[PDB]
Structure 1
């Protein structure tokens, strides 16, 4: 039975979806256990128009597993513990010299400028999580567990692996930004390299 390759980053463009470009990665825990969990990083299209919306233009969002609502990406990076804007961009953009990529990242940073606390970001992820959250303490611990295990398991599942997950998430974002800029071609689903 043919299946799409796991533990890889694939960027596709979906016309119907509100996201102009969507980058998905399906992660499995070295095939040892657990179902494969897919995490999507998507960029909203500039077609949506508003006084603030047109100014921000393209804004990156992430569909973390087991969280019902889309989460802004800068919030995910802050939830991992990288609070500073410069450090988040350091993980996302490997060379700060290029202006275009930084311009792409700017709107998403503006959207998440309300949240500057790691605990607050974790609470926000828990609150918008599909599973109900009774209190702030419970929501924070639940969202931390989701980030530790459910999201990007192949990078790590325990052992304080937040830095590795942050770098791989930033790689997904970097590839999405390159696709949006047009520097990298969008991946093809039919290639038999991808079809294990």
Structure 2
């Protein structure tokens, strides 16, 4: 609650500056507002009998500045929680309050009905997984990561790297999939866009061993496909031209590509400056994992693993 309150609490409206700057937040005990306006403690038995909601009001601090405590809403309280009256109650107190001592709590009382939140099962984020596609499809292997921010807002940005061409086909190339870009981009171009211009450094990042000639042979078509791009600026403007449909001149395309790489390109490693080395290393690790899966040195990841 405090993390969400302090996440985005300052907003500027326009020396005429208006700010809100929401302060700390606290949760009070469960209370009920009557018809005449009086207030009293709301116990779970009374809430169940009167078809009320076992919710407790909460307040925040405004602290308005131009250059007190205010009501924001009512939050339902789970039974037998820290804010519930039954947390510290003994057996005698529970019997007096007409509550069964064998009750375990863990449910919400809304509108006089008991509701239980069923746990939802989802795949873990920030995990690199490799799977093999169908034979008729032109994609052999896919390596994708569902990057997401924990403390920050929900993003769920998926970066998928696919190996184009089947084993029989000689046109074996690797193309990634940047967010908000509707066409696959070669890995070498993306690596150049991160500032790693020389090809030897690209190969060093991708493979950590100089004796694995099969991986270098597979990467050779990629580095050949990266012949056109030779500097960081050309890669950046190529990426920018692959985004917006030439709405503005190519001068802003480089800035747009840089911003998209700094923000959405794997937004779990970091988001500030100095991200080039770490993101390039992570991309190289992903490529290495994909090639290891292709080289049958590792098994396909299981989606049923707990």
Change in Cα spacing, 1:17 to 1:147, as seen in structure 2 (3 Å) is farther
- Distance of 1:178 and 1:27 partners within structure 2: 22
- 5 Å-filtered alignment, 1:36-75, equals 36-46=156-166, 54=170, 57-75=171-189
Verify: 1:129 aligned to 2:260, yes or no.
no
Change in Cα spacing, 1:179 to 1:47, as seen in structure 2 (3 Å) is closer
Encode CA deviations 1:58-110: one digit per residue, 9 max, x unaligned.
Answer: 10000111111100000000000101000011111111221011011110111
Residues 66 and 130 in structure 1, CA contact (< 8 A), matched pair in contact too? no
Q: 1:160 aligns with which of 270, 274, 290?
A: 274
Residue aligning to 1:24:
144
Q: Structure 2: give runs of 5+ residues left out of the alignment.
A: 1-119
Residues 62 and 71 in structure 1, CA contact (< 8 A), matched pair in contact too? yes
Residue aligning to 1:87:
201
- Distance of 2:247 and 2:192 partners within structure 1: 20
- Distance of 1:26 and 1:129 partners within structure 2: 21
SS at match of 1:154: coil
CA deviation after TM superposition for structure 1 residue 164, in Å: 0.3
Residues 138 and 166 in structure 2, CA contact (< 8 A), matched pair in contact too? no
Residue aligning to 1:172:
286
- Distance of 1:17 and 1:129 partners within structure 2: 26
Change in Cα spacing, 1:31 to 1:2, as seen in structure 2 (3 Å) is farther
Verify: 1:141 aligned to 2:262, yes or no.
no
Q: Structure 1: give runs of 5+ residues left out of the alignment.
A: none
Encode CA deviations 1:98-138: one digit per residue, 9 max, x unaligned.
Answer: 10110111101111111111110011111112565521211
Kindly name which structure, 1 or 2, has the bigger radius of gyration based on alpha carbons. Answer: 2
- Distance of 1:131 and 1:9 partners within structure 2: 32
Residue aligning to 1:12:
131
SS at match of 1:10: strand
Change in Cα spacing, 1:119 to 1:19, as seen in structure 2 (3 Å) is same
The structure whose residues are more often helix, as a share, is 1
Residue aligning to 1:2:
121
RMSD of the alignment, in Å?
1.6
Q: Which has the higher contact order (CA 8 A, sep 6+)?
A: 1
TM-score between both structures, scaled by the size of structure 1: 0.89
Residues 144 and 158 in structure 2, CA contact (< 8 A), matched pair in contact too? yes
Change in Cα spacing, 1:93 to 1:26, as seen in structure 2 (3 Å) is same
